[PDB]
């Protein structure tokens, strides 16, 4: 929105001493004339009068500490002054240090004290507009996402993000990953993931977040490193997890899609990523939402018999994929709810691989006797027990199928 004005100290509006009403006259003649004057078509009109010397001499002369006889325009006169050199600085290209002048001297202005929350809302965005604009300035957007966006957390609340200035804030803010320069830092630092995941926690900013993540996965997968893996399965995780029994059930099955899609991106997926992946498909099977778990159970099938590759030597045998994969979630004790009848769904899946690679011919003999021995850790189950009444006919039938 516009700037706030700087308000006087009385006001009228049609020891008293109102002003009177000829140099009420005077004064509006000197408005008229001021108006005619263009003061502001003329000292910023034409593109050749802009230059170092004005950038400098105009941001060096705001007024920085709070006095009684400036307490009236003290926190606007701030904002004008930043705001007119950021754009007599977009006309200027250069960036060899007038760039870091601009950007040294306005976070020095920002860490004044005293100032209401609507200015240090407003500081943020030309702060990472002068980001954006400039480079090689790495050391004070890592000042910036440390200190002036985590730990100052009462000042940046849920509704101040939700309005369209959170929002282009957001898009300018994740803009900057795709440029050249900034990309370095922000492919594994920590504080930066850990802000994406609050806000990923709130709830208006979750569909603007999963297009850009999506966007920059379906691009090309160089966001992915070795470094920086289980943050944003993390999200991902978190994403997924935001079930309610209403829309953003679809906007859950969608990154449900995408972390099923995650594997192909890349051959070189190393040992410890994969088994995360089936530990965050198959711990959504969990949610209370019944429509989440359909859709969890037949994708996580869907990726372990499509996608997976054991010949390659990531994996010396599939059993790692039960073995490695999907035996975390299975050791759950002291559940008493949440451990009934779950355990027959993902013991379905296990089957269901086991039966396409049983198929495609790849086990071995001890493979069949361990998921027995699985199947024994829970058998005295009733259900459990039922459903296991009925492994024996399917075991002979496959066997006898492949074989002849």
């Given at each position: 929105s516009n700037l706030p004005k700087p308000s006087p100290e009385i006001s009228i509006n049609k020891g008293d001493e109102e002003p009177t009403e000829e140099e009420i006259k005077s004064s509006k003649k000197a408005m008229e004339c001021i108006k005619s004057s263009n003061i502001a078509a003329s000292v910023f009109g034409n593109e050749s009068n802009i230059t170092a010397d004005l950038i400098k001499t105009l941001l060096d002369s705001a007024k920085t500490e709070k006095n009684a006889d400036n307490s009236r325009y003290f926190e606007a006169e701030l904002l004008f002054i930043i705001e007119l050199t950021i754009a007599l600085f977009l006309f200027c290209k250069e960036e060899k240090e007038l760039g870091k002048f601009i950007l040294q001297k306005v976070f020095q202005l920002s860490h004044t004290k005293g100032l209401t929350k609507r200015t240090v809302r407003r500081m943020l965005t030309y702060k990472i507009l002068l980001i954006s604009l400039c480079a090689d300035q790495t050391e004070y957007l890592s000042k910036l996402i440390n200190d002036e966006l985590l730990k100052k957390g009462d000042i940046f609340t849920q509704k101040f993000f939700a309005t369209n200035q959170g929002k282009e804030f957001l898009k300018r803010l994740f803009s900057l990953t795709?440029?050249?320069?900034?990309?370095?830092?922000?492919?594994?630092?920590?504080?930066?993931?850990?802000?994406?995941?609050?806000?990923?926690?709130?709830?208006?900013?979750?569909?603007?977040?999963?297009?850009?993540?999506?966007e920059s996965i379906k691009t090309d997968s160089n966001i992915l490193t070795n470094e920086n893996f289980m943050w944003v399965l993390g999200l991902l995780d978190e994403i997924s997890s935001m079930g309610a029994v209403k829309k953003s059930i679809e906007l859950s099955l969608k990154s449900i899609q995408l972390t099923s899609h995650l594997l192909e991106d890349n051959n070189d997926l190393r040992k410890n990523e994969i088994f995360a992946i089936?530990?965050?498909?198959?711990?959504q099977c969990i949610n209370p939402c019944k429509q989440i778990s359909e859709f969890a159970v037949v994708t996580l099938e869907q990726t372990l018999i499509n996608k997976i590759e054991i010949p390659t030597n990531e994996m010396e045998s599939v059993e790692e994929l039960i073995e490695g994969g999907l035996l975390p979630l299975l050791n759950s004790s002291e559940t008493q709810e949440d451990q009934k009848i779950l355990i027959s769904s993902i013991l379905t899946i296990i089957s269901n691989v086991y039966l396409h690679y049983l198929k495609l011919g790849k086990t071995s003999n001890e493979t069949f006797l361990k998921?027995?021995?699985?199947?024994?850790?829970f058998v005295e189950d009733s259900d459990i027990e039922k459903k296991?009444?009925?492994?024996?006919?399917?075991?002979?039938?496959?066997?006898?199928?492949?074989?002849?």
């Open positions: 795709e440029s050249e320069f900034y990309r370095g830092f922000l492919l594994g630092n920590e504080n930066f993931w850990k802000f994406l995941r609050k806000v990923t926690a709130m709830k208006e900013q979750s569909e603007s977040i999963f297009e850009y993540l999506n089936i530990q965050a498909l198959a711990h998921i027995l021995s699985i199947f024994n850790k296991l009444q009925q492994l024996i006919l399917d075991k002979k039938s496959i066997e006898k199928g492949n074989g002849s």
